[PDB]
Amino acid sequence: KNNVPRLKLSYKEMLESNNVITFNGLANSSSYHTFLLDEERSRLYVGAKDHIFSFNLVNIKDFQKIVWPVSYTRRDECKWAGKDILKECANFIKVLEAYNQTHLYACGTGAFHPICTYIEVGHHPEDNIFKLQDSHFENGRGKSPYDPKLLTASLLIDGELYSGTAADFMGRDFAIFRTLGHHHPIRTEQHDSRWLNDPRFISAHLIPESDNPEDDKVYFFFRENAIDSGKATHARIGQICKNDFGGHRSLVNKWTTFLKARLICSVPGPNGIDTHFDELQDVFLMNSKDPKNPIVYGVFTTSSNIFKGSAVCMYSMSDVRRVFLGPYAHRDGPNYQWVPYQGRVPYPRPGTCPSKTFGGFDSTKDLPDDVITFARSHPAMYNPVFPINNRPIMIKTDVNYQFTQIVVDRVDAEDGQYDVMFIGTDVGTVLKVVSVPKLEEVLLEEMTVFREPTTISAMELSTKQQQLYIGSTAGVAQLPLHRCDIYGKACAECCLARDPYCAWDGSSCSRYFPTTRAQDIRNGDPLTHCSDXXXXXXXXXXXXXXXXXXXXXXX
Amino acid sequence: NNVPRLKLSYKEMLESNNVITFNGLANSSSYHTFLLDEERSRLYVGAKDHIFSFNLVNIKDFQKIVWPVSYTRRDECKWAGKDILKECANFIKVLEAYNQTHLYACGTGAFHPICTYIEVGHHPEDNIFKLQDSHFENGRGKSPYDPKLLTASLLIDGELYSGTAADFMGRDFAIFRTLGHHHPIRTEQHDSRWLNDPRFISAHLIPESDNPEDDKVYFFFRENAIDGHSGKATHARIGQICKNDFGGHRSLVNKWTTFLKARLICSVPGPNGIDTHFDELQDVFLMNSKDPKNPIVYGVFTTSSNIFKGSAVCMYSMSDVRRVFLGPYAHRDGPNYQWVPYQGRVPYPRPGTCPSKTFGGFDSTKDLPDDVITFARSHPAMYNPVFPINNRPIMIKTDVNYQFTQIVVDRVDAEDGQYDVMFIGTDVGTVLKVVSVPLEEVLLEEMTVFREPTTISAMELSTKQQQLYIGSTAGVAQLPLHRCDIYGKACAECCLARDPYCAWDGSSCSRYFPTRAQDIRNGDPLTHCSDXXXXXXXXXXXXXXXXXXXXXXXXXX
Ligand SMILES: *[C@@H]1O[C@H](CO)[C@@H](O[C@@H]2O[C@H](CO)[C@@H](O[C@@H]3O[C@H](CO)[C@@H](O)[C@H](O[C@H]4O[C@H](CO)[C@@H](O)[C@H](O)[C@@H]4O)[C@@H]3O)[C@H](O)[C@H]2NC(C)=O)[C@H](O)[C@H]1NC(C)=O
Ligand SMILES: *[C@@H]1O[C@H](CO)[C@@H](O[C@@H]2O[C@H](CO)[C@@H](O[C@@H]3O[C@H](CO[C@H]4O[C@H](CO)[C@@H](O)[C@H](O)[C@@H]4O)[C@@H](O)[C@H](O)[C@@H]3O)[C@H](O)[C@H]2NC(C)=O)[C@H](O)[C@H]1NC(C)=O
Ligand SMILES: *[C@@H]1O[C@H](CO)[C@@H](O[C@@H]2O[C@H](CO)[C@@H](O)[C@H](O)[C@H]2NC(C)=O)[C@H](O)[C@H]1NC(C)=O
Ligand SMILES: *[C@@H]1O[C@H](CO)[C@@H](O)[C@H](O)[C@H]1NC(C)=O
Ligand SMILES: [Ca+2]
Ligand SMILES: [Ca+2]
Ligand SMILES: [Ca+2]
Ligand SMILES: [Ca+2]
Ligand SMILES: [Ca+2]
């Protein structure tokens, strides 16, 4: 399930051949981690240390910036709090999502006093404003963490900010929060490992269930510690009802819809001891024709220090729902095994949204007390969620690096459509991989996008611009989703490359458009399609005249 | 985790007289079942349809007993469905000394296990190797029917302890005693609390006191975890029986009452506080100290995963092990309960404790009260696991594509002092020679002992002959424990080699006996010797110059 990359471009190869556009970043900043892509304006907003940037999608070297650090007073408290002056004692932006048609909402580590603000961007004729509207500063507790090292799932829909993070200086009170207008702040329970057990949040997504948008749910993806003998990590998926408002007598201003299930990403072994990849890292939804069933792509890595491994698992939303409808997890006590619950599941079912249609019940505060006391105590489901085909799409263990981030384009090619994964790496590398069905992953290329290795922290994709954007504390990098010239001048090579983007021009290898032209994504032999030492790898060499084959062609 | 200093391919070895090879009889295989007998300097080996008697000086000199099954039996086995070449024969699986003139031998009987005695002389030496015949004893519970299943076996006071499958179907695992003056005794049956589909590895009589009624038999093995819920898992285990355990009065008639088992843990602490485990036990090798009641258990372990191949060597203290077998028993009130350290009243005498004549009076296991028999009927497992000396492996091997299979350890008396030299076999037909320098493992050499890769199944060591003997289905191989010439002609190199066996002669690098100049710690030639693609591999090259630390540089050209 490993591969050898077909092509391998070092940073220098890249920059000389104009693949990368680099932002080395401001010398008084770092942590260019918090991405927000806005196609409407063609801009890539980025939250960093003491700044937010507004990058032009056409070329990130063209940008504006907002300077938004904390006061001297605050720098000083944070210092004497003990914290590291360069890495902790500043305003590290951690949250940056759209708000109304003219504003973003932004939150940052406030040198361990989290804070928020709005940022003016235009509406659609006039919209390259980047004004930092000032002296509101809202409180960032439960929105951004105090610690920059902690990450934070966040999602902002209907002017309300959902966010999973630590609520406290000490960095231990984790929770999913809703804040901002029109309703009392709601969160998960507190000091209750059944709900969340020292978790690390990764992303959150509003996924519609029906055509009625009161049925709408918010899905959080994260990882946490198992409750048992042996310390362990469980990857998790989490469910809230958009329109959940808290309970009447119990669970006042706390979720009642909260349910969570384990994500399993494991490779079946011969002994029937599977190999698990429990450390969730990025998640990326791929939108299908149905907005109620995106295809969840998830990046996972081994828990072990000794063995470095990485994995990519796909997950079906109807698979996930089955799990959230099946048996709840249960014990009669602390000294009991966890067990599928077969008592009476109170009605309406915990997990189900309030509706105006079925049940009658118009709110979460109209709920009976017995559905509230269940789910107070059965937040976890019993069944785990398994990937499509109970296997990873892809495994990477032979090698010394780990996967960090992912995005996926849906390239419309000659044979058909193909899902092209771009995977970031804790060594500053991107893998471009094609899922060609029968699946076969074909590792097209492995590119180095930073002068020096750093972990890639963020990756976003612009189909309009055909570009890929990358984050790290070192800076931001820009990539074309394809440069088809890079393969051969000859036909043979452009066909062999197996690149959904790249078809044979006639004259020389270039972008493929619908409706002359001759690529082969399956199989990829130049013979039946092109009608005419060290190469780039995956070809074996023979001296007789050097040769290269694995179709064949001399050198 | 290391790079081997030297690496000898099979050819290098055979050309330089390191290996003596037995490619084995063409109508045989599975040269797996070793019995070393220093007294009459011979290495007995149980194979497919034969037992061999190899001369320890040179295994090319040998005798053999031909002991296959009848036509009748070949024929049943065939029609039982079994593979004619790999299953339908007498694969010897057990071969231990019996009295001063006899061995006891047992084999897969083409899925009808059988045993026999083998005459060897009184001491003399008279080299008898007579197969005493037509008395064939029943091999059930002694050898398995399946050749692929392994079997711990130990024979002391004319009684054969053995852990294996008792049945054709290969599922009824148990520790057995047979050949008694006493009724046959075994573990319980169909009870995963006791043994849960285990794979036995070796068994050892380890004295507790000076009174040899306190003697215990320790089995080393692995098995499946019991959960309660799913994650399938392997636990490495150590197991305890009382030599003189005879069964219970009313209950556990002719079954062990002394049986207790504990988990062996061999794990590397991780930064997140998720340790990395090596649960698959493979070989075990006791190293005898001045105290025969505390040998140092060396154990070879590998990962359970298919995807990630890893291997590990963990040492274990016998006083560590005993603490565990005296501590809390494992317990549940039911199937849906967590396992829990037992804090009820532990009936007396303690389950696990041997019958003695000294204290209490109680002269047997059948004199035991019924309440100590009903406990231990149900608490055969201990709660605490056993951790290695320093909660770490001695050595880890994960970067590489092979796994460890077998081990032995010599205690080389060197100039600086004593050093424990591990020889480790490999599922690729390779031996690693490793030195534990005090902590630091130094991978002296990595040798290939079979023309083609096969798993090493057996490894035995002869200090008298200074030789190492290896097993596989392909055959048997012989190694000198040292060939000191192999390093440099110069002093520098022989010192650098860090080999307990090898000191600098004066004239040229040779064996060390109690003018010499070795350095095992550190190993720098400067303070000890007062005189391109390098030969070494832990040396770096600045072009061709050569420099390794332990820094020590010298101009290679
Ligand atoms: C597997 O392969 C080998 C063949 O490569 C085979 O070994 C042969 O076995 C037989 C008996 O097992 C040996 O017979 C012996 O031959 C010597 C000559 O040096 C004789 O002294 C003896 O022959 C007599 O054996 C009995 C003596 O008590 C008499 O009853 C009988 O009349 C025999 O004539 C002695 O036994 C033969 O030498 C070996 N040797 C070799 C080098 O092959 C082995 O049996 C095969 N195993 C099987 C089929 O299980
Ligand atoms: C981190 O480093 C940066 C230096 O690399 C700092 O950037 C400076 O930030 C200050 C205030 O935050 C700006 O002050 C402004 O002055 C401009 C003057 O016009 C300038 O316009 C462009 C911007 O498009 C600028 O690049 C030119 O130098 C022009 O002179 C006024 O528009 C405003 O009134 C405002 O006060 C500096 O322009 C800006 N300079 C540079 C070179 O970046 C940043 O403040 C540092 N942050 C810290 C220490 O927290
Ligand atoms: C060692 O054991 C073997 C087998 O038990 C003994 O061999 C037999 O001894 C019996 C009496 O016990 C006699 O009838 C025969 O002389 C032997 N026959 C066979 C087929 O083995 C042997 O005597 C014992 N040797 C000792 C104690 O030195
Ligand atoms: C967007 O929100 C801000 C207040 O946070 C406000 O000043 C601005 O007018 C808003 N725009 C709307 C509601 O269109
Ligand atoms: Ca977002
Ligand atoms: Ca991402
Ligand atoms: Ca053979
Ligand atoms: Ca033995
Ligand atoms: Ca062994």
Swiss-Prot record, chain A:
GO cellular component: cerebellar climbing fiber to Purkinje cell synapse; extracellular region; extracellular space; glutamatergic synapse
Sorted UniProt keywords: Developmental protein, Differentiation, Disulfide bond, Glycoprotein, Immunoglobulin domain, Neurogenesis, Secreted, Signal
Cystine bridges: C78-C89, C107-C116, C241-C353, C265-C313, C484-C502
Tree of life domain: Eukaryota
Residue ranges constituting the Sema domain according to the UniProt record: 6-481
GO biological process: axon extension; axon extension involved in axon guidance; axon guidance; axonal fasciculation; axonogenesis involved in innervation; basal dendrite arborization; branchiomotor neuron axon guidance; dendrite morphogenesis
Domains (record comment): Strong binding to neuropilin is mediated by the carboxy third of the protein.
Protein task: Plays a role in growth cones guidance. May function to pattern sensory projections by selectively repelling axons that normally terminate dorsally. Involved in the development of the olfactory system and in neuronal control of puberty.
Family under the similarity heading: Belongs to the semaphorin family.
Protein name according to UniProt: Semaphorin-3A
Species for this entry: Mus musculus (Mouse)
Organism placement in taxonomy: Eukaryota, Metazoa, Chordata, Craniata, Vertebrata
Originating gene: Sema3a
Portion of the full sequence shown: 26 to 569 of 772
